[PDB]
Design a protein around this ligand. Structure first.
Ligand SMILES: Cc1cc2nc3c(=O)[nH]c(=O)nc-3n(C[C@H](O)[C@H](O)[C@H](O)COP(=O)(O)O)c2cc1C
Length: 362
């Protein structure tokens, strides 16, 4: 089984290719990492296994979901440290995903109920609705288009959070540049129609993610940095007229950064829509990238094996199946039956129900 072939992700020696995909679970009450998260990650940690955490706030204005962890305060750093130690004790490698939602927010998630920030004043349409703290759904508001000074500030937020992540003991961080969030709002031409140096051409649309990655790279080292994008996913009205070209353009930026840094990023992480055309899009991005490639989106044991075997990806990340199967790695290795997951408890707040109460093997 290819999934259990060792792999060197930079300085990190992984014993298998099954990765825990980053997943927002909303158990981090008041944006503070709780003990429950420790139990959760520890249940899924394996020796030499790679784990990516739920999206984590880089500032007070970066959230769009309830009770998601942050890492911009020393209090959050101290709490994260406890979780990282528990995970490291099992011999797992873990990265903290830095997440800023941009316009995918609500005044209820913003300080002083201010408006969410974005690349333009374009709001997500009524085709989508945001999950509110009380479990109902609300209207995505019109965002405030930021200037270049504020853009530099946001980049600084990523840099600080990355350092905080290292201070907490994380092996690295992953820049969440996909699924229609802040970075994707600058990338996609369906959204970004700015007239300044951050808009217009594809080159300009890629400026933000380039500066964000360079900033974190300069702060903690390329090998401790992973980057996630989803050029072919139009979630939250974030579509581009030429996904493959957008993807290849981001890839060129990453290769350029590595060469200029004289080091390689931990990896490029790409989420695909879920068929032959999509699979060709993925492989094309991978072939263009000088480094480790992590594929995600609707993968199964069989599809994961096929991916590594056909050389389509070095590592495979699982989300939903990892929610209901804490020992997903072991089950995949023994090819044991998987348990079903309950979507109703994907984003609830209980520290146990639908979070750490999914059973281990029979
Ligand atoms: C409940 C839930 C929360 C998620 N949270 C995040 C997140 O915070 N950041 C991110 O980049 N992807 C997130 N994802 C997407 C996953 O990382 C992953 O790409 C997706 O689950 C892959 O498909 P799979 O569930 O079929 O394995 C989430 C998915 C689910 C189901």
């Amino acid at each position: 089984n290819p999934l259990f072939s060792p792999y060197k992700m930079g300085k990190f020696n992984l014993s298998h290719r099954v990765v825990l995909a980053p997943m927002t679970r909303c158990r981090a009450l008041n944006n503070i990492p709780q003990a429950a998260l420790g139990e959760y990650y520890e249940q899924r940690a394996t020796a030499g296994g790679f784990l990516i955490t739920e999206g984590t706030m880089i500032s007070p204005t970066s959230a769009g979901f309830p009770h998601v962890p942050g890492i911009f305060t020393k209090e959050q750093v101290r709490e994260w440290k406890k979780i990282v130690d528990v995970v490291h004790a099992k011999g797992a490698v873990i990265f903290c995903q830095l997440w800023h939602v941009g316009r995918a927010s609500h005044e209820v998630y913003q300080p002083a109920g201010a408006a969410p920030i974005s690349s333009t004043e374009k709001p997500i349409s009524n085709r989508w609705r945001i999950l509110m703290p009380d479990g109902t759904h609300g209207i995505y508001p019109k965002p405030r288009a930021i200037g270049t000074y504020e853009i530099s500030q946001v980049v600084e937020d990523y840099r600080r959070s990355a350092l905080n992540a290292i201070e907490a003991g994380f092996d690295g961080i992953e820049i969440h540049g996909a699924h229609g969030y802040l970075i994707d709002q600058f990338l996609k031409d369906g959204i970004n129609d700015r007239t300044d140096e951050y808009g217009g051409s594809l080159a300009n649309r890629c400026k933000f993610i380039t500066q964000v990655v360079q900033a974190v790279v300069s702060a903690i080292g390329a090998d401790r940095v992973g980057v996630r994008v989803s050029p072919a996913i139009d979630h939250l009205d974030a579509m581009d007229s030429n996904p493959l070209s957008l993807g290849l353009a981001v890839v060129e930026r990453l290769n350029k950064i590595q060469l200029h840094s004289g080091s390689k990023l931990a990896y490029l992480h790409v989420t695909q829509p879920r068929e032959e055309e999509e699979a060709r899009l993925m492989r094309t991005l991978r072939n263009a990238y000088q480094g480790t490639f992590i594929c995600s989106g609707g993968y199964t044991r069989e599809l994961g094996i096929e991916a590594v075997a056909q050389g389509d990806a070095d590592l495979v990340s699982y989300g939903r199946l990892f929610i209901s199967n804490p020992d997903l790695v072991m089950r995949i290795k023994l090819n044991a039956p998987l348990n079903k997951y309950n979507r109703k408890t994907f984003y609830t707040q209980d520290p146990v129900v639908g979070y750490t109460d999914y059973p281990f093997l029979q």
